[PDB]
Symmetry: C3
Subunit: 216 residues, 3 copies
């Protein structure tokens, strides 16, 4: 309900997740198997994007049949879509960027919103409305680790979730920063793997991603 | 008249153009000769910037004497300038970036507007008002080809026109992407060439730019 | 009072400064000694950030005891903070990014504001309200020298103050550009130096920074 509460809630969700998979469901029959593969590998928090028609149905199925998993919605481009996912049962909302509307929509919503930003001005726009937890997108192109450090100076009280360009080669560098909650990506969700139903490959890849984070 | 119509119109203009030259007229007597040089080289769509006083006069002269060429205006920084170029006869408008005003100005205008963006948040700001065709500026600094690909994920239904840093060495890489309508630049409009009236050099350079695009 | 006046005033302040040190006071007893060290090295214009509690007190002490120095405030994230620093005695205000509020706050304020921007859209947002002097942040990540040159094309009548990534290795490259007023940084304000009170090291470093700018 309170802005400071959503900041804490979204913070709890991201720390327990560690790695936020950006899922795009192309086929209905892929919801559960995909979800079980990730879950077995240690990834219990999912981000289902509205990048496909099956977006909403997926959130619903997962919220009724896999209640143990924490499922959020992504690629919400307007207040209309924001309202939809909220009814579908999403536990949190994620966006690629911000607008005045969306930011106010997250202030009135019951579930927390992790807005996506790229620049200091965009951070301030959400800072003013009480946002303290942001998603950096695209991570690499925006300046990656160097950017996160730069923003830490003027905005020392905000945490980030870099997404876009994050992979096994740079995943620890990001997680090393004290102001990074978790990272997001799709490197364990290879397209070919999903089609051919190679769920053992996905399960193995998720396990590797989680095992990669354990030291600093 | 309709937003979806302008999206299509601006899309038609950019596909037939392939290469959008960003022109800045420093001398009146350069309008036609410059225009004929480009036109002979295969470049029939021009973007006259308001970066100089001769901006408006150029659009007018070209619209009355070279009706066969498709001429648009660029570097429109406010609703006032937007209104001016529209009266001057510009067939479309281009901007380096976006503001709330400008975006609404393009919704009320009769001629289509290709707004310039750099980040996902900026894309969304125009997406909300019905824009589906954007100009990436500055292309190279914003992430070039990698950026275009990144934006394709969340915004898979929008096309781009990269400008800034585009040259013969990277022009095909951009044109290879399915979500790139055309590219813009000034590499065939060398300053020295214009002054000394070396129109043969410009004509040859335009021909080379068009010939460079033919395979993928 | 007039927008065009603040543009000139802020321009005067930045040219006489050459190098704008971004200060963060961690201890009260560091105000004067730090200020005298910089001043002796040739740096008479300071930017005290509100990144710490001692921000406001510092501006006050410096405005009453070191009236010969030109002191401004930084890291002003809202209209509330903007009003505070103005009462504290700041001679100018600086921000890491922009918002609609802040930009209007600088239009009503008596002291000039140097807003921080990263992209063309952000520049336009402030351009519309009459701003012609901007701070590029983060300089390096935003495109550094190449970015400054790119923005010079469409916005040929604005000057910049790059901050973030500026150091002895690239400081002259920036100062060479005709549309750069000055640069900002913290490379002469090493943390360890401040704690251990190594003011001779700071004084020597400031002198070196000023001596580095003399040729182009």
């Amino acid at each position: 309900l309170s802005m400071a509460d959503k900041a804490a809630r979204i913070d709890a969700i991201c720390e327990k997740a560690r790695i936020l998979p950006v899922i795009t469901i192309a086929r209905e029959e892929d919801i559960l198997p995909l979800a079980d593969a990730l879950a077995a590998g240690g990834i219990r928090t999912l981000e289902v994007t509205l990048r496909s028609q099956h977006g909403l149905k997926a959130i619903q199925v997962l919220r009724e049949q896999r209640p143990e998993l924490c499922v959020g919605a992504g690629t919400v481009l307007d207040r209309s879509m924001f309202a939809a996912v909220e009814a579908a049962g999403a536990q949190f909302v994620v966006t690629p960027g911000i607008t005045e509307d969306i930011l106010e929509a997250g202030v009135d919503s019951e579930i927390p919103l992790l807005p996506g930003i790229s620049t200091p001005s965009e951070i301030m726009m959400g800072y003013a409305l009480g946002y303290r937890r942001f998603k950096l997108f695209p991570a690499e192109i925006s300046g990656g680790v160097a950017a996160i450090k730069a923003f830490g100076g003027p905005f020392g009280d905000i945490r980030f979730c870099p997404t876009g360009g994050v992979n096994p080669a740079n995943v620890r560098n990001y997680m090393a920063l004290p102001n990074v909650m978790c990272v997001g990506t799709t490197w364990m969700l290879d397209s070919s793997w999903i089609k051919n139903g190679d769920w053992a490959r996905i399960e193995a890849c998720s396990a590797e991603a989680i095992a990669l984070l354990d030291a600093n």
